[PDB]
Structure 1
């Protein structure tokens, strides 16, 4: 490509993470994740356009690519995926830590909103957590019914406000410590119940103020839902009030 092209001689593979993605070192000093690529050349080149043109502190940062063989090299996120990070009971989270996980994602989403980029799959499983516990959204490129507003499920109407909906569900995931949304319903029953105006209950760890913020993401009318800029302000206000 250009400066984005990484010499694969400078990569050291140290451990396998999952599926294939491996932990490694770049030029000796830099900790990295290395994805072995499945997908066509047109589908890769479009996914490259996104990663190379978007950059924020709370988005998983591309470092480079190896396209003369193929690897995608990124920022390393020591604590792995957010959903599993939440589920590990050893952490024993204070509620302030949980609100700060929401703020991180919201900052990422407010950036993506400012660039008119639609994420389309915001959920805890697609967020990663670094060594300092900072949560970052994977912009990179089984329908996610439980994260979808009614206008997506019925009409496939995607917009900034369907990401907002999803973010609300992501907050719920965080405050429930990584439970499945609507865990006792099927996907089909979830789509029916949300059409009838049913919404997720307030998790015990979520205060009334925090719950109001996540609930504002689930208004039936898409245009009644806030922007990510508004949500960020509301989160910041609660952080100052409740701590």
Structure 2
């Protein structure tokens, strides 16, 4: 799982993601790859390195595949499969008005399938959102960055009371207690479905973190996107049930959403 620096070449910078810059490149005797160069100070590197081998064993057609880590020299690099079309969030926003509702549902299903695999593996994403899903060939969506907030060194992001905490995607037991589970990922998935059917609109736009907490705690929920059917919106609302035990598992979501899609 360790990749030597001599085994990588960097071709072009493609953009910036969690923890630092990403390049298109090649990996010796292997493939074309994406390579993320971890910025100094952003990541708990030793903690991540301990987990990297087990993260690589996670492998599913709808999850971004970790291929290895280049760690001989600072800064360290993570290497993955290459996805051509960037973040799902940007992809929806830049092409707003073009997508059929069926295509939007299909994106949610791809995400749901990857999350079902994580659920079965007992791996919690912790920060699932359109902004960390990537878009590949034929508009396949793959889930990325699962578990990575365990290594983010910015306390304002990782603490529930932090000024940058991703409260818009957090279930009440996460925003209250940092009680993460696959059922808190299910809540996040409901907000992501909202993002997709809204073609990358910002959820709770111009609500402060404290306002989102208050709204959710007093029963407010995101409005139905025009492109979401009443049935799809019912499923979204299932993901935002207050009690995690009342939210469907991803395995159940996947069945429900498939039946809607295939009929």
Q: What TM-score does the superposition give when structure 1 sets the normalisation length?
A: 0.92
The corresponding residue for 2:78 is: 72
Partner Cα distance (2:30, 2:176) in 1: 49
Q: Is residue 106 of structure 2 the alignment partner of residue 109 of structure 1?
A: no
SS in 2 for 1:59: coil
Partner Cα distance (1:90, 1:163) in 2: 26
Which of 21, 40, 46 is the aligned partner of 1:42? 46
SS in 2 for 1:132: helix
| Structure 1 residue 32, shift from structure 2 partner | 0.9
Runs of at least 5 residues in structure 1 that lack an aligned partner in the other structure: none
The corresponding residue for 1:52 is: 56
Partner Cα distance (1:195, 1:65) in 2: 42
User: Is contact 2:241–2:247 with CA below 8 Å preserved after alignment?
Assistant: yes
Q: Is residue 9 of structure 2 the alignment partner of residue 12 of structure 1?
A: yes
Partner Cα distance (1:40, 1:196) in 2: 36
SS in 2 for 1:198: coil
| Structure 1 residue 40, shift from structure 2 partner | 4.3
The corresponding residue for 1:61 is: 65
Partner Cα distance (1:236, 1:84) in 2: 25
| Structure 1 residue 30, shift from structure 2 partner | 2.2
The corresponding residue for 1:23 is: 24
SS in 2 for 1:136: strand
Runs of at least 5 residues in structure 2 that lack an aligned partner in the other structure: 149-163
Which of 249, 256, 261 is the aligned partner of 1:227? 249
The corresponding residue for 1:174 is: 196
| Structure 1 residue 11, shift from structure 2 partner | 2.3
Which of 151, 167, 175 is the aligned partner of 1:145? 167
Q: What TM-score does the superposition give when structure 2 sets the normalisation length?
A: 0.85
The corresponding residue for 1:32 is: 33
Partner deviation per Cα, 1:23-64 (whole Å, 9 max, x = no partner): 112237722101112234422313414422211111100122
The corresponding residue for 1:124 is: 130
Greater alpha carbon shift after TM alignment, 156-165 vs 197-206: 156-165
Cα RMSD for the two superposed structures: 1.7
Say how many residue pairs are matched: 238
The corresponding residue for 1:100 is: 106
Q: Which runs of 4+ in 1 moved over 3 A?
A: none
